[PDB]
Amino acid sequence: VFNATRFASVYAWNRKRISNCVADYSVLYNSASFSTFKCYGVSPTKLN
């Protein structure tokens, strides 16, 4: 999803379904990568 080489087009975009797994969102928050990162629905620290 995030590290994929080529995303689909915004005209027709690829929707990746993520289910039945362990999602660790702290690695993304600790290591600085995203230039613009904002969570409207929930808090970025409460994601985990």
Place this chain on the structure above:
Amino acid sequence: GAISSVLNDILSRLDPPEAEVQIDRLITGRLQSLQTYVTQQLIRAAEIR
């Protein structure tokens, strides 16, 4: 008017400064609920006496 009625849901989702906005809406309404109940009991209390 709040996102959710449960307080733990707001605390587990919004940031501390953002949660205050949603918590205030719940407190404001729940405050009116008590005022309505009490006001109704005092009136009925005058009828029973």
Place this chain on the structure above:
Amino acid sequence: KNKCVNFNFNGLTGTGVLTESNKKFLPFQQFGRDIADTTDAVRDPQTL
């Protein structure tokens, strides 16, 4: 069990005394609610 504790089950946070319930939930049902819509009972996701 038989003690007041702070429980987090499948992201559901709350404080209450945990006891064994005789109510039988259907396989698909998950969390029950009482007359007040507050959680009546829960289900341990690991050991059902």
